[PDB]
Design a protein around this nucleic acid. Structure first.
Ligand SMILES: NCCC[C@H](N)CC(=O)N[C@@H]1[C@H](O)[C@@H](OC(N)=O)[C@@H](CO)O[C@H]1NC1=N[C@@H]2C(=O)NC[C@@H](O)[C@H]2N1
Lengths: 44, 91, 78, 103, 60
RNA sequence: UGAGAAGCAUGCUGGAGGUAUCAGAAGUGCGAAUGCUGACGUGAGUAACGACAAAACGGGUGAAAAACCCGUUCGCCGAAAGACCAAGGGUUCCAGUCCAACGUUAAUCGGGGCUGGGUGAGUCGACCCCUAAGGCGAGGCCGAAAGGCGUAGUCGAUGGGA
RNA sequence: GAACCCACUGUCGUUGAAAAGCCAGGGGAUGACUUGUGGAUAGGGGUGAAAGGCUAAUCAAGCCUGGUGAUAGCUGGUUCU
RNA sequence: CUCCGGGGAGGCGGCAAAUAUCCUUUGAUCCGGAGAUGUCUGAAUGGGGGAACCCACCUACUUUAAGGUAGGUAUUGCAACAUGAAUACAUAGUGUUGCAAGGCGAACGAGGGGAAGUGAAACAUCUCAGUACCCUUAGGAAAAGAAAUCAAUUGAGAUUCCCUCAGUAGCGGCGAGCGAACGGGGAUCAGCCCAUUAAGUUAUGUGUGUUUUAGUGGAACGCUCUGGGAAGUGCGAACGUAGAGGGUGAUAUUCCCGUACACGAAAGGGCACACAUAAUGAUGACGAGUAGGGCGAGGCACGUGAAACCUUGUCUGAAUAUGGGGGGACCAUCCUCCAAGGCUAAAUACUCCUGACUGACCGAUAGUGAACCAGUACCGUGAGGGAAAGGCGAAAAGAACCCCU
């Protein structure tokens, strides 16, 4: 049966990407939190 | 195109059965080149530093392998190869 | 770009509605703002300002030229 | 104090206490002495280089604080101090104050 | 070598840099082919290239 | 040995710390909370080994062959169980070598470990020129702030252009 | 009436081959049709040929992090002589 | 990589041994200071974009082919200049140059908005609480501050913080709860101006003093017994302005590194005080749409109450030193102060970070989630969640060689 995850890299980058996060204040706060926690990879 | 870039364009020759057959049969040289080098750069570099006349250049890029030593992973760097065709019998 | 009076600086403030059973809910009080065109002789033109009726009372008492000079000195494009 | 690659030392602690020789190398806090502190090494032969293996005897390092410089005149263990003779620093024996013999 | 390197003019230094880069390329080719047993030649060529560029920046 | 929580002496193991007396302070005593973490039992050498398209023999190699290789027969698919492309994956592709772990059995075999190779374009595709839905948006209008919408523009293929 | 899209009956399966299937039958099959790529609508909100249906195996108010060690006149447990 | 200073025999960073080529007393490795170089993304700023990519233009030099070097090309605000509509003067608009800003980061400060779980043994006033959270924006601190203030013997004398007064006076479905001030004792102490204009502060240079970024010297122990090994037993000795600590084959003041103490800086940095130049303070010259009032709210311990006082959304509205504000409804008398203009150190709050030192704090299920290649493996579309895993030996001396397979 069809499952929930149907991967598409263009959609992945446009929804969860670095520039998408930079575009809004809440996304910049997300990036700040992840930098403070010390994640090795900030975004997808 | 300057001399400083000229001395960095080429890296070394390729030693393999395919390269050996190509050289022994069609007079084609195989070189490892800089990843950012272009065909015109390669042509001018070969012509200046080997005194032979180049007919055409073909290039290809091979991605590096990802493999493990012990408990850590690693990746090798990409390698760009150049197939340089010379005229008649040269080099 | 806001409900702010150019002449006096008034703006909405917050408060409470109070019912007969003393229930309190948040509200705001708004200024009596609106647009008005004033003839300015020194520059031969109409200047349009967003201001309150208290702003008009101040303009009536002091003159339009003095008020415009004060706003320009405060750094507004009038 | 100081102990360098050429001096004559005497072992003051360990299984080799009382013996003497010439130091071979100094590195960190370990020193090697000629003919002293020998070990038996079971060496496997090296396929690439041949050199069929066997049992060999070689020096092993001691702690640098287990050896003392030797005073030739009195043949006894001694400490090392520094003195500015003329305009240059030099090593001297604490007991007598004379200059330390060179290698 | 920087001592005697500093005792040369700008034009001499630039030429020296030119044959030094040429020599570095030649040594790289020789080592890649396997005709060079000693790599300190490559190391010192690199080092003097850096030295000449430093001295040129200082002198200009 | 003492009424008890417990104390004392000593054989073996172990290989560097322990601590009287009298005071002082507590992370001070566990069998249970369908308590928490790790290790190991019973069921039990029990059920099962994943489409009922199907296998048989000779030779080879090997420590070992029902499963690998070569050969001779038998059977199954054939609008897909064959041949391609996009998306997605990323070396799984080829050769040599190894069999501990992985493969629902063994394995000399492998999409497994190790070493070394391999992707060649003016014409194929992308990049590039053009725009749809839609997004962003100099000035601008609006909003306590953060911001909302939008003009000129600028992007955006699933479409047009050797 | 094939492909394709559905899901009416029965057997089996229920520590399954499968966290919704297989097999034998069944319905629509030029239309209010099926489908790829890319977009829009966001939680007392959305969307709904309307079942309180669906909104990432979660829905009479999604998920995550904070207030937060919420409160519990209730149940359990509470270690030497 | 370069220079300056230190230092004096080894060195070529770690996992991580071996090996090779080697460097170094013509002074290496190493330590401190000052310089040179410094790809691409990212506020990212030439345009665009799915971050680490795609596409450009203009100058100067260089090439003869299809390029190379360097510089420049964002927006907004301010200033100068130029140009310039409807529209005649003009203004709007447009461009060039020069200057400045944007982003990030622990806590503390100030300001704009602002809950509910809960308690009241139910619940709506009330509480929780101006707490959590969101937004804007400083500084090394911020804010406040020199009486239109309190007091009530006619006395005190700017602001801030701590101890009392006191769980008192009061507020309150007079419930649950909330909760002062006066006075007294301390910490620190400081005032100066409104157009000829002050104290103070910030930059720049000079001078003096201190501190800091490498380092140098630095005392004194032998014999014997046990033992694999002595620092341990037994016997005697020495230093102490040094008997802190760490290491060495078991427990060391006299073996090593050190310790007390005494010395030390080419060059650079901080702080302190004093001079010179800037600049600021400093659009402001005694305070009118202001004080006061009517209506609705908010703040004061104070919930409309006998409710003074402060702020203002709306409507109004004085006197102006023979004047005006306050003393908790209001009036009279007394006492006290002068609003509608400004600047100002200390005592106070905090720790992303740096150096030294300390613990009746933990010792691998503890202590940070993380002693180990941890915000990793792994889970999730995503925000996010989130582990397990320390110990051979003093020294590899890490088992040559033989046998089964
Ligand atoms: N601290 C909180 C006290 C709560 C009250 N006590 C509850 C109460 O008694 N409400 C009643 C009630 O709602 C109803 O009359 C009746 N009885 O049904 C109305 C009819 O006018 O009158 C209300 N009374 C008031 N309205 C006024 C107001 O809001 N402001 C001023 C003063 O006039 C207030 N008092």
């Amino acid at each position: 049966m069809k499952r929930t995850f149907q991967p598409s890299e263009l959609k992945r980058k446009r929804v969860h990407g670095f520039r998408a996060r930079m575009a809004t204040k809440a996304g910049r706060q997300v990036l700040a939190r992840r930098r403070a926690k010390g994640r090795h990879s900030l975004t997808v | 195109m300057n001399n400083e870039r000229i001395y960095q364009v080429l890296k070394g020759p390729v030693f393999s059965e395919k390269a050996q057959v190509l050289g022994d049969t069609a007079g084609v040289q195989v070189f490892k080149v800089d990843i950012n080098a272009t065909k015109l750069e390669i042509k001018k570099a070969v012509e200046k530093l080997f005194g032979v006349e180049v007919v055409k250049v073909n290039t290809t890029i091979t991605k590096g392998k990802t493999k493990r030593f012990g408990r850590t992973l690693g990746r090798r760097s990409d390698v760009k190869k150049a197939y340089v065709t010379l005229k008649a019998g040269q080099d | 770009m806001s409900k702010v009076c150019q002449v006096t600086g008034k703006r909405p403030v917050v408060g409470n509605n109070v019912s007969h059973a003393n229930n309190k809910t948040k509200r705001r009080f708004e200024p009596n703002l609106h647009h008005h065109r004033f003839w300015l002789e020194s520059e031969k033109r109409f200047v349009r300002l967003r201001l309150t009726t208290k702003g008009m009372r101040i303009i009536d008492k002091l003159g339009i030229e003095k008020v415009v000079a004060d706003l320009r000195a405060q750094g507004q494009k009038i | 104090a100081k102990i360098k690659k050429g001096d004559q030392v005497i072992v003051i602690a360990g299984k080799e206490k009382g013996k003497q020789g010439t130091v071979l190398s100094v590195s960190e806090d370990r020193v090697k002495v000629e003919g002293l502190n020998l070990v038996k090494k079971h060496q496997k032969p090296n396929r690439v280089t041949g050199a069929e293996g066997g049992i060999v005897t070689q020096e092993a390092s001691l702690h640098i604080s287990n050896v003392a410089i030797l005073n030739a005149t009195t043949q006894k263990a001694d400490r090392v101090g520094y003195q500015v003779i003329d305009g240059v620093k030099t090593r001297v024996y604490k007991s007598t104050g004379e200059s330390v013999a060179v290698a | 070598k920087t001592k005697d390197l500093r005792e040369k003019s700008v034009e001499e230094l630039k030429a020296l840099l030119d044959e030094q880069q040429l020599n570095q390329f030649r040594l790289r080719m020789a080592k890649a082919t396997g005709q060079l047993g000693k790599s300190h030649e490559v190391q010192v060529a690199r080092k003097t290239i850096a030295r000449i560029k430093t001295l040129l920046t200082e002198k200009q």
